[PDB]
């Protein structure tokens, strides 16, 4: 056995290009964690390797063919899981080449989780292009908001920023695999962000006041205005306790007008089955037949 | 000192010894490091007294020996010229907070 | 009678800050103070792998540098069963015994500058000046080379470095003689020496000193003929062993331990074979420039060795070699992972200035210098 | 300001500040507060780069910049106020020198500097720091000059703090260390006008405490001359009562009516007159200083105080006195 | 010479047998005595600043040959060092008013002060 | 550039994009190249292997050479 | 035992998650599981501006994740109980290891 | 080995190794007797205490493991007895026998916390003077807790205030794989 591993760890080696420095994923490659644990320590071949031409697979996978091992994994992932059906494996023999036949963009949502389903740096995060390393980043096992899905989610971040957005496994939300709204809405996180609580002074521009002056004007607003008048709003990525903390908040200044960005007029929110996805997501595997009223899910 | 505290009782009979030491202690302690001007011996007692009731719910009695120990070092260095005077002397709602951070 | 003895000379022994309860001239008990150079050495090696790690060891004892990084790799092999070559041995052993040449260059003649004599400080300077350009030749920095790596040694000697050990070692008979006709003869010396700190062998066994403190008493105990640890088992080197345990003997044997570690020298230089400078095990020895270069998988290696690193496998041992110092051990415990795990360093100065209490009773306070000088204290390890 | 950090010493506090009387007996607490507090100093120096070298430390790493400024020229000030958002001003002289006049001290330079930080928009506090009762028609030039200053800084840039701080104790100062060592003339302490002055010392920490306790608050103590008087409104002979309890040394002291006190200062008033050597800066006998020293007018009236910056001062016996047991 | 006020005067006493081994840009006069005795004293330079000189000003060219790491005189050096990319010395003005003292990209001395905030505030 | 401008501020020497961008491509024979590094395989990168199918050149992403094929 | 080992008392308020890291999803490698880390929050960092690097003002910064590793949620809970932190145990989510075939992928669509 | 055979089997209580140095991890309250033996017996004559090294299993019950290192210059043969003690048990010292234990048990209490009993003169020896903590525990940041120590207006004096630093960067080289 571990001569039949440390043969084909040389074959994997063999064609492979030295990219490790420049590759991405050059900490966290199962190549390189499976030649420094398994493979072994010193390579025969002294030829010219096989190279492969960079695919351009979109603005989200950075691609290098070369150093990919055609170990298919990918061009599974896309036919199953992201069902799009767009990456191949072109070709046969060492001439194997893993990518669409034409210039064709992954359109498809869910189609960056390959890059965590990559084995090796060829497949790699675009917007991750090379800003980090699998060792600096630090890693807390948040949660996601963009959808509500509320996939799980391994914010890696390197420092005061997020530098990478991977997910992780939980076998009831999302089993290994993050949309792309997820894994590349880390940018917004450093962007356009209000750092500063700005009022409006006699002009029309703001002034970045502080936050005593800032929560004294909105408190005097809101005690010269009937009551009735006042609304809550509450955004679509607020947490259960701000949101707990508005209504608590509007319904003492007697009003009754909070309500969540999305859910429109008259939402029966009485009975819990009205409002979720009673079968689990993971139920949804021992479903028979599906109606997607409307609901367009793939969205 | 071996932990005779086989009980509570042991214990807190040793607590009350370092007590009465550091109580009787107090004198070289203001004349070393010069408190008898700024500080009443009422306060130190005071302060020493706090101590010892600020840690008073421990249940357990070998972290009230190891306690004990920490405060017999701490001594033993404020009496000898271990450590300095300038923290001896030292010795001896929600809004306000999230004015200043996030934390 | 409490004093306040410091550092008598800068620069010498650095931040000894002894507390002396004398009487009169006499002392009583001498109470050193460690910690004034307590460097976070035993944490921060737990925060970093088996590589990093190394760097310290020369940092440990700074006037014998790579004896420490030998006992540091000899025990990153003794978990790792990393079988390093002969030539690795025979370059590791003619440098950690061009090390010992160089602490007892300095730590008799620093000892002889603290006693008075001004003069064998800066001979035997010189002279260490000569061995750390070798030091400096085969590694890069003149002190601290950490050259001496875990699995086998850094990097080759230079074309050129074994025949200028050799022509070093031609003329070291006679800078040993120097040093020895200015201090072994004198009569302010032998006066200044003779019957200072005497360590009868039974103290010199309890205090742990284990070094050339226990080679004075008359303890046949070197770590090099006890437990050979290299080549030092084909290596032939007399111990010289003190008769009275006064540090006119600690002297005379540091004055012979710097002819024998020349017999050493002059041995590994006769008979260095020409094999390879690491071991062939590339998952425990960075790969050349060249290989990782033009070979992929050892281009891997280099990869998860400068960033992983071993990750030697689970066990815990004690390997001690003789550092110049005394028996300067590493207690290296290591979890399955790439960083030590309470990587302890028993360094000899924290056994031997224990001994300064018993050492320098009864003795005159202008002696106490001179059993700090004999101990070969270098707070560095303590 | 903008803030990003928790304490001081490695955080940020959004004060570039150029405390341009850094090198001195207040600057070195005023900077270590806003360097340890975590905000940037460009401190300015006039000489010897030696001047500032006791404040690169208590900064973090360029948290302190002390650059070299000549007073009289300007493009230099205009230089060390280029990056900047807060501007103190403590350069200020209690003795004239045959070089720079009361006036080119104290007021002429307080209105420069309040000239060029203005042209610098950007400049959000601008803090003056002048002597506690200096007000025109104070017999002290140096008084007098230092109102000047205060009247010139506030018209030239509203909304300018202003401290007027009495005279400051503390290690290095210019009030008690010049008292000792001249009791080291056996004990005799010459008070003069017989004590009967009445003026409010303050621990130079506190002081320090308060410049920058107008540049943590709001958009008020903008254009508000503070009093930073103290505690325990005390008497010149009070207050040697004191540095005799720590220096232990026994009280000796001697009455000098005024006219004998401004006699033994009439020389070293000769300063614009003996040019080819430069006089050894009148430590006690300082006829301005006398001149203050008649009149006890340094006392806080009812402006602002400690007590309009959340702030309430140390005593002066103790540890803000403790300076003095160097001297024992 | 004419300066009896420095070590220089221990170089001019040198140069009495000793050969002149090419001369960089700066002036500085590098000198070789060799076979007569002292290794290690056998390779020196003359600043051609003889005073205000300092180390350091000793081009990369001839560092290599006047510390006997190599035996290549900058004149030799000279046809390897690389024209697209190569960079004059710069004596290491270290205190030397600012604009010649290096400063970081945050100094606030140095001109063009970068932000290091991460986030792009709005 | 403005990557380059994030690192270098003297912005009077040619910033490095631009020296690479401005040395031409070499032609080479086969459709894989080598790229040892400058000339030494010892002192240059890992040896880095490019492939030269498409007409457009082949940057060699450790050292920002170019290769075309020169068919 | 919080009082006595010597850690401040403003880091003994302190409110921790004990979790397990997860895998990580780039590599599919299950030689870093099994380790429950406590997870001191430590979020504050800002950017030291005089150079480009952070700056922690938090002890506990690195600790949570470097050298502090339990190997079970009862020792790990036990210490951070001790200690007397405000742990809240985040519980590793798991993987079914479903039962799946080559056969499958050549399954008959019958017709 | 001759030593477990004539070694009272209590006295060797929890484990035994047998390569990488030969250890008897005993209790703690059989450890100073245990060192009893060992020494000032005919047959196994260690007299070197050569190391007293804490090591800190934080997910351990026990959570210290005080290894007591033993040379035995007679019969050229090393030993490493241990026990297993965690922050508040007291155990035994070793002081009296061979009097190199004073030092290096001052050393285990300072880094780790593990109080020797009847040990004359336990006091921090490596750590600060008004040090608060136990250093080489596991739970002790590296860059400790208030250990920054710059000068200030209280003159002569160098406070110790909360730390700041830049932020040690943990770096997860470990791999999968093992
Ligand atoms: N000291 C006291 O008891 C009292 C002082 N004050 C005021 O506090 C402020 C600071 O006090 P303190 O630091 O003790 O004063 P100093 O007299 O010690 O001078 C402090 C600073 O002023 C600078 N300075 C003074 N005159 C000039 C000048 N002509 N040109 C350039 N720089 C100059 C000094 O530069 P350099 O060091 O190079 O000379 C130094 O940086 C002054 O406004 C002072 O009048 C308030 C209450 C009383
Ligand atoms: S995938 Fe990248 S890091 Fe891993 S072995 Fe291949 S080139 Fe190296
Ligand atoms: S998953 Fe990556 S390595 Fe595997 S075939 Fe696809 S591109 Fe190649
Ligand atoms: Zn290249």
């Known amino acids: 056995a571990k001569k039949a591993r440390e043969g084909v760890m040389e074959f994997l080696l063999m064609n492979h290009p030295l990219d490790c420095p420049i590759c991405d994923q050059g900490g966290e490659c199962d190549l390189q964690d499976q030649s420094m644990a398994f493979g072994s320590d010193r390579g025969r071949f002294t030829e010219m390797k096989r190279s492969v031409v960079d695919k351009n697979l979109g603005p989200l996978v950075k691609t290098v063919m070369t150093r990919c091992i055609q170990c298919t994994r990918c061009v599974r992932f896309a036919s199953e899981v992201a069902g799009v059906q767009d990456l191949g494996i072109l070709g046969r023999g060492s001439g194997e080449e893993i990518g669409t036949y034409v210039e064709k963009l992954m359109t498809s949502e869910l189609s960056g989780n390959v890059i965590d389903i990559c084995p090796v740096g060829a497949l790699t995060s675009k917007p991750f292009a090379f800003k980090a390393r699998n060792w600096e980043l630090k890693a807390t096992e948040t949660i996601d908001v963009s959808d509500a899905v509320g996939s799980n989610i391994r914010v890696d971040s390197r420092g005061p920023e997020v530098m990478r957005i991977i997910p992780r496994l939980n076998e009831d939300i999302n089993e290994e695999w993050i949309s792309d709204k997820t894994r590349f809405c880390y940018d917004g996180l450093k962007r356009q962000r209000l750092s500063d609580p700005m009022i409006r002074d006699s002009d029309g521009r703001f002034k970045a006041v502080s936050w005593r002056d800032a929560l004294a004007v909105v408190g005097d607003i809101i005690h010269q205005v009937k009551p009735d008048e006042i609304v809550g709003v509450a955004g679509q990525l607020s947490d259960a306790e701000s949101m707990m903390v508005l209504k608590d908040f509007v319904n003492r200044m007697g009003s009754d007008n909070v309500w969540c960005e999305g859910t429109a007029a008259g939402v029966d929110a009485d009975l819990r089955y009205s409002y979720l996805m009673n079968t689990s997501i993971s139920g949804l595997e021992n479903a028979d037949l599906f109606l997607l009223i409307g609901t367009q899910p793939r969205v | 000192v071996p932990p005779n505290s086989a009980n509570l009782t042991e214990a807190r009979r040793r607590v009350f010894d370092f007590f009465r030491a550091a109580c009787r202690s107090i004198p070289t302690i203001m004349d070393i490091y010069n408190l008898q001007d700024v500080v009443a011996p009422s306060q130190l007692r005071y302060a020493i007294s706090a101590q010892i009731r600020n840690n008073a719910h421990i249940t357990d009695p070998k972290v009230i020996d190891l306690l004990i120990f920490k405060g017999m070092e701490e001594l033993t260095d404020i009496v000898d010229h271990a450590k300095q005077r300038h923290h001896i002397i030292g010795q001896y709602d929600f809004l306000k907070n999230f004015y200043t951070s996030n934390y | ?372 000088g004999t101990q070969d204290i270098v707070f560095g390890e303590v | 300001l903008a803030r990003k950090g928790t304490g001081g010493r490695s955080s940020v506090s959004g004060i570039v500040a150029t405390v341009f009387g850094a090198t001195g007996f207040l600057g070195r607490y005023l900077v270590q507060q806003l360097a340890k507090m975590g905000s940037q100093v460009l401190v300015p120096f006039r000489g010897s780069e030696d001047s500032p070298r006791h404040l690169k430390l208590m900064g973090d790493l360029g948290q302190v910049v002390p650059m070299k400024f000549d007073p009289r020229d300007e493009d230099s000030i205009k230089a060390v106020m280029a990056k900047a958002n807060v501007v103190i001003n403590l350069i200020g002289r209690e003795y004239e020198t045959r070089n720079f006049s009361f006036e080119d001290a104290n007021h002429h330079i307080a209105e ?91 621990y130079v920490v506190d002081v320090a405490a308060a410049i920058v306790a107008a540049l943590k608050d709001d958009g008020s103590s903008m254009g508000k001359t503070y009093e930073l008087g103290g505690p325990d409104v005390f008497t010149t002979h009070e207050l040697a009562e004191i540095m005799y309890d720590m220096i232990r040394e026994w009280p000796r002291y001697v009455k000098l009516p005024f006219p004998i006190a401004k006699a033994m200062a009439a020389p070293r008033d000769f300063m614009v007159n003996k040019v080819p050597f430069p006089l050894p800066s009148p430590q006690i006998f300082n006829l301005d200083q006398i001149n203050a020293l008649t009149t006890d007018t340094l006392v806080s009236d009812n402006a602002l105080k400690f007590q309009d910056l959340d702030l309430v001062p140390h005593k002066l016996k103790g540890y803000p006195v403790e300076f003095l047991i160097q001297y024992r | 010479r004419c300066l009896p006020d420095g070590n220089l005067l221990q170089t001019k006493i040198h140069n009495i047998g000793a050969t002149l081994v090419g001369v960089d840009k700066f002036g500085n006069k590098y000198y070789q005595k060799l076979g007569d005795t002292q290794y290690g004293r056998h390779r020196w330079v003359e600043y051609a600043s003889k005073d205000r000189y300092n180390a350091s000003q000793v081009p990369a060219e001839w560092h290599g040959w006047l510390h006997f790491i190599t035996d290549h005189t900058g004149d030799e050096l000279l046809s390897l060092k690389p024209k697209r990319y190569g960079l004059e010395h710069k004596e290491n003005f270290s205190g030397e008013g600012d604009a010649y003292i290096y400063h970081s990209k945050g100094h606030t001395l140095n001109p063009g002060q970068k932000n290091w905030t991460r986030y792009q505030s709005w | 550039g403005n990557h380059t401008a994030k690192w270098m501020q003297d912005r009077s020497k040619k910033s490095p994009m631009e020296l690479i961008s401005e040395v031409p491509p070499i032609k080479v024979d086969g459709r894989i190249v080598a790229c040892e590094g400058d000339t030494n395989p010892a002192l240059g990168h890992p040896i880095e292997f490019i492939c030269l199918d498409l007409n457009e050149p082949a940057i060699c992403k450790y050292c920002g050479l170019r290769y075309v094929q020169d068919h | 035992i919080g009082k006595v080992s010597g850690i401040p008392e403003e880091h003994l308020s302190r409110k921790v998650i004990i979790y397990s890291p997860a895998r990580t999803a780039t590599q599919s490698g299950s030689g870093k599981l099994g380790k429950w880390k406590i997870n001191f929050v430590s979020t504050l960092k800002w950017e030291n501006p005089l150079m480009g690097w952070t700056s922690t003002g938090d002890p506990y910064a690195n600790v949570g994740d470097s050298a502090l590793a339990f190997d079970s949620e009862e020792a790990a809970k036990s210490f951070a109980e001790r200690h007397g932190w405000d742990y809240k145990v985040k519980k590793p989510n798991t993987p079914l290891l479903k039962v799946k075939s080559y056969s499958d992928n050549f399954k008959w669509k019958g017709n | 080995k001759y030593s477990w055979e004539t070694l009272p089997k209590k006295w060797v209580k929890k484990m035994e190794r047998s390569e990488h140095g030969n250890r008897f991890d005993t209790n703690t309250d059989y450890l100073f007797q245990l060192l009893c033996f060992l020494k000032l017996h005919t047959y196994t004559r260690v007299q070197v205490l050569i190391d007293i090294c804490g090591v800190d299993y934080p997910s351990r019950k026990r959570r210290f493991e005080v290894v007591y290192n033993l040379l035995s210059t007679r019969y050229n043969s090393r030993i490493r007895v241990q026990t297993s003690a965690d922050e508040v048990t007291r155990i035994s010292s070793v002081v009296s026998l061979f009097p190199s234990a004073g030092w290096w048990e001052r050393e285990v209490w300072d880094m780790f916390g593990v109080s020797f009993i009847n040990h004359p003169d336990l006091r921090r020896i490596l750590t600060d003077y008004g040090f608060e903590g136990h250093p080489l525990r596991k739970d002790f940041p590296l860059s400790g807790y208030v250990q920054v120590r710059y000068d200030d207006p209280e003159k002569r004096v160098v406070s110790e205030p909360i730390e700041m630093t830049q932020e040690f960067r943990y770096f997860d080289f470990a791999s999968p794989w093992e």
């Open chain 3, 1 to 372: 009678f409490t004093l306040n003895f410091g550092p008598q000379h800068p620069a010498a022994h650095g931040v000894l800050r002894l507390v002396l309860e004398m009487n009169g001239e006499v002392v009583e008990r001498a109470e050193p103070h460690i910690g004034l150079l307590h460097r976070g050495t035993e944490k921060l090696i737990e925060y970093k792998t088996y590589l990093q790690a190394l760097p310290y060891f020369d940092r440990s004892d700074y006037v014998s540098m790579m004896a420490q990084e030998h006992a540091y790799s000899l025990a990153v092999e003794k978990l790792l069963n990393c079988e390093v070559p002969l030539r690795a041995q025979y370059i590791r052993v003619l440098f950690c015994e061009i090390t010992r040449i160089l602490n007892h260059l300095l730590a008799l003649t620093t000892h002889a500058m603290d006693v008075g004599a001004l003069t064998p400080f800066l001979w035997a300077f010189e002279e260490r000046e000569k061995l750390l350009e070798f030091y400096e030749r085969v590694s890069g920095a003149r002190m601290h080379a950490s050259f001496i790596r875990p699995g086998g040694v850094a990097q080759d000697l230079p074309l050129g470095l074994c025949r200028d050990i050799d022509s070093f070692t031609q003329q070291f008979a006679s800078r040993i003689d120097e040093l020895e006709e200015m201090l072994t003869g004198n009569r302010i010396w032998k006066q200044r020496l003779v019957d200072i700190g005497t360590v009868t062998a039974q103290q010199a066994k309890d205090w742990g000193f284990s070094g050339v403190m226990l080679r004075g008493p008359g303890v046949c105990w070197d770590l090099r003929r006890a437990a050979p640890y290299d080549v030092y088992d084909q290596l032939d080197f007399d111990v010289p062993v003190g008769t009275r345990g006064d540090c006119y003997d600690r002297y005379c044997i540091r004055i012979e331990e710097m002819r024998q570690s020349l017999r050493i020298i002059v041995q590994c230089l006769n008979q260095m074979p020409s094999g390879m400078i690491k071991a062939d095990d590339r998952k425990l020895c960075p790969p050349s420039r060249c290989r990782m270069k033009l070979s992929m998988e050892s281009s891997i290696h280099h990869f998860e060795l400068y960033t992983e690193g071993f990750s030697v496998p689970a066990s815990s041992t004690y390997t001690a070699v003789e550092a110049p110092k005394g028996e300067f051990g590493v207690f290296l415990v290591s979890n399955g992972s790439n960083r030590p795990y309470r990587c302890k360093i028993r360094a000899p100065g924290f056994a031997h200035l224990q001994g300064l209490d018993f050492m320098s009773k009864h003795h005159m306070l202008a002696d106490v210098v001179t059993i700090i």
């Open chain 4, 112 to 202: 420069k500097l309040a000239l060029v930080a203005k042209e610098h928009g950007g400049i959000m506090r601008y803090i003056q720091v002048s002597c506690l009762g200096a007000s025109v028609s104070s017999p002290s030039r140096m008084l007098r000059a230092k109102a000047a200053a205060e009247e010139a800084v506030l018209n030239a840039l509203p909304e300018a703090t202003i401290m007027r701080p009495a005279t400051m104790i503390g290690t290095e100062d210019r009030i008690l260390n010049p008292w000792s060592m001249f009791v080291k003339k056996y004990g005799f302490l010459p008070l003069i006008g017989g004590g009967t002055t009445k003026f409010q010392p303050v």
